[model samples]
Target: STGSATTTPIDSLDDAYITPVQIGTPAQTLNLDFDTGSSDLWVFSSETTASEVDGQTIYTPSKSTTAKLLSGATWSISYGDGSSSSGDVYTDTVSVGGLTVTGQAVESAKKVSSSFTEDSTIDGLLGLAFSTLNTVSPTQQKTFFDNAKASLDSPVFTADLGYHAPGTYNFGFIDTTAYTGSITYTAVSTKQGFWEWTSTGYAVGSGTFKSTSIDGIADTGTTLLYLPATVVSAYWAQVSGAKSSSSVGGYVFPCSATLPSFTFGVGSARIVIPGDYIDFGPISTGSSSCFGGIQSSAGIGINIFGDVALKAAFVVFNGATTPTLGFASK
Candidate 1:
């Protein structure tokens, strides 16, 4: 069995599978969902069946010859995006990416009703965001990270998303090549998964923006950038000379304009999203209107670094190491 490819177990990935991996152990492979929106790990169980749930990864007790339940521990999670799931505590010899660990913490969900479940192909969601968002309350006993950290080769994890993009999302590990200079880290907010800040201001192009800037967290989980109305209006005032148009989502500016440059300071880190990313207009949709660089959402409480911002730099979600995050070449 050790030397025969024929003896190797059949590859376990669906056609649309971004990546297939066993998270528990070879003998007890646990499927996982690589998610960037939240942090935490979970799997299904015998009590969880594909028939009852429509579509999900079922962790058959019999399949895991070495599975154990924690008798009195249970976990339930609700995401900011208005989705939730819950299950009991179970221990198993888990395997992932050809690596194996004994007695790994596994959660068996009895109910999972998020839109995540809508796509039968994406049966599980692996949370690798920040610990602040982990659904596991300290009162819930132990979490997948709480138990697995000590066993990892390094306490850090990386997400290899380039190959799986436009459709695939990944979790775990850190790529040292992601940055050129020293890694600048920001203390993650005590808030939940939706941890973001306000950009002091934005950059229209290279080396441009207010010296008095605010930093905002850019996140891919969010579809659009939510700028403060005041900030948005102020930005529009600067770009007012340019033709203005609305309708296209987010901020869209003319690609050929000598766009003003804005820069945002994040702690000691500074980031600028050029006017190009903001060029989300009728250029291709056959409409003629200069899209402003910022969308005005005055009442939107918090600033969100949605798709446009995240794609510009690499985002590092530090696990238990600390409540912090790193950004570069996203």
Candidate 2:
């Protein structure tokens, strides 16, 4: 009784990584962004306003017999516009891979932010973060991770973001062949509802590994790998024409620049992100400048070990009583 989910990256830039999720008895299929950064499983639904519904798939709860409104439940994240970024809740049978969870809280979006509407590729978000971060009101609802733990043979999930390709998520047991090196386990702080951990150090390409305890959260929802200004500057320094541009709002360099690989330490293990992963993409169509996949986290407040870093390693989110994060090279 374990679970597994397939992954698919949309487009070259990986605007969003998605998986098909089943909701309710009729089981409406929606391409959901499996986000470990948040804990509320929300979707564009029949409850959503027409204006907000452009090209995204909307869940029809009325068609599902198991769909039941969670009386007073509502969710809100960081978003607002003419329409509020909040939603009502419904309890329904939810399924991902082969595992099924009865009476899972599925937050139906009444109105979403411009970000959600703008990106028609994603229908919703299936939160994999700790239940502590769920946006549900009154009594908080458990995340898909928390609720599925019992059904799983083991309370764990592994993430393998395949370079720029579709990665995979496996529940219960880790795939021995998915990684080449021994998996390094680090204690994860879930008090803040994120898979936050401390990297022992970092090294730019073949440069010296800076011995510093850099704290950051491993986020799948975020596209780039964000680090301290010092680390980011050091990485960009290697590229000849690299510069932190106001026009690009981040570091950019010649599209053909020879970029250096970035590495972050997990325990004693340093996972290396190849140089090509940092090239990102061209800033503009005819522009020779390319935006960097690594950026400074000064404005973000928290450093993020996002997709850029995750793609280089097989990451495990251990949801045990004492949560731990595991990293391994592929």
Candidate 3:
């Protein structure tokens, strides 16, 4: 995003999107993800088979003058569900937030599951978090953050999760303008780099659901807002045309002369999820258009306010102080 360098690379899934980075003489482009779950920048490589690499972004080193693979340090990662992706390590010049660092380590995964291998949107992932979130290690122990510390303007990067439309891979950038106005800053809980909070309850439209009380944990790692089934059902009841469907993940209602508005109460602060986000179906499939607001979840010991909530406001992690969190104007 700082220079004008350009090159052609493969998206993990073959879909192409621009990932402008300030690398090389001119800005370079690498399909990347703004992944919060972990802090590691990686891409799929050409050694991969057509099947193992279908629809996955691939990085052709031939186009990069500064990229090299880790011949002996190939790595594998498995999620909780047994889904896995494996790739070799590679080092290349990488950049983010207007800073470029040379010879940054990255994983070049060859094998990935349907969950990731199927989405050929962005070329790879850009991990922006603390060192604890990185999956790779330097043995003696240098982390992705440790390497980038010198390049960062302040060693802190934020995710502005603004979703414009539906695509295999959608792109967004953190707008500093969103952080303007008065802000309530919160501290990051030391327990694994997650932002946790205790909320009073949630609301939809003008109706406040009594049983909707739930503890809130702000997570950028997740894509959407996930709530207990009960809470979702309680909120939908207030809408005049709100209806449920079996095909989609959340509820939907007709767009009418009078569109509905809903807000969730978090402690003393309340943030509203606009109705436009809920409409998911790009093409008309039925009488009802899909909405992307509150979604249903099971086995909930915690409530995750993911990208949808974070995009609407500016959030700062106060690791400088105690383990606490607050909201502020962006």
Candidate 4:
């Protein structure tokens, strides 16, 4: 029903998963992060204050004849003393790999946080999560996926992310060749606006599989795999010299240390996260220790099966009447 779009990693750790998006008439192109964790297709725009603008390319609504301001609409994801990214809303022709969504809500920035201004790789964020999480005031906007779902042959999208290589995000149809074996599907809970599901538990390396239930959300926007403290401790205990360093903040270990692979259950099928994937990268430039990709979701109670875990499997976000998530080994 929909074609595939390729996304590239913005850093060595693949921290930023970016895809090209065409906005407005004549198609002004920008690389936007496709984030499934939050809902709001917000962008740096011509209206952004010059002090907040850095290397990021701004979307100029004035440049496109088709762009129209949505009367009395505004969006804001975060705001505080020093950090903020609030803006006005507009409707424009937005395209992802030629799949067009005309009159799509395009959040135009009036002010941006310093964190966003410094990240030159991404010009905006296109949310794929449930529209219930949209931040627009007066009138909540639909996400690109929700807007486009009705016309799609099947209301679905698939994620085929790579650990060190570019990945593909295909809409509407699953690419069977991208994964091995049959997909194991499980119903997802959109309570709290997330693709939340209960994992059947986990195992460290070749250890016995635990049968305890773990509630977590699949977030494509985040970079690490954050689980319960017990699981995180169990995983790190296996790696010699691994420690939850306060200085470095989070688990860290020898760069040359041998890491055990992690496995988690999805119904009867199990997906294995390669040891190499857990070895995120050096803690810093040419550092002797590396940060563990799998960390404890202790303080932040929401367990996140983020990119670190996502890159190890092929994921299906089924947007059918009854929503579900499907996972298969790749």
Ranking by lDDT: 4, 2, 3, 1
Q: Using lDDT as the measure, name the better of candidate 2 and candidate 4.
A: 4
lDDT score, candidate 3, position 22: 36
Model 2 whole-model lDDT (C-alpha atoms): 0.88
**lDDT by residue for model 2 (17-52), tens:** 988899988889999988888888899999898898
Instruction: List ranges where model 4 is wrong by over 4 Å.
Output: 79-84
Give me the displacement of residue 82 in model 1, in angstroms: 1.8
Structural RMSD, model 1: 7.6
* Cα lDDT over the full model 4: 0.89
**Which 10-residue window of candidate 4 scores lowest in summed lDDT?**
76-85
lDDT of 1 by residue, 5-39 (tens): 00111122111222344543335443455545555
By the TM-score metric, which is better: model 1 or model 2?
2
Q: What would the per-residue lDDT of candidate 4 be over residues 39-144, giving only the tens digit for each residue?
A: 8998899999998888888899999989999999998896211445889999999988768888999999998888889888989999988999999999999999
- Give the TM-score (vs. native) of candidate 2: 0.96
For each candidate, what is the lDDT? 0.51, 0.88, 0.54, 0.89
Clash number for each model: 33, 0, 40, 0
Q: Which stretches of model 1 miss by more than 4 angstroms?
A: 1-19, 25-32, 44-56, 98-101, 129-146, 152-154, 163-174, 179-182, 191-201, 205-207, 211-227, 231-264, 267-269, 272-302, 306-308, 318-323
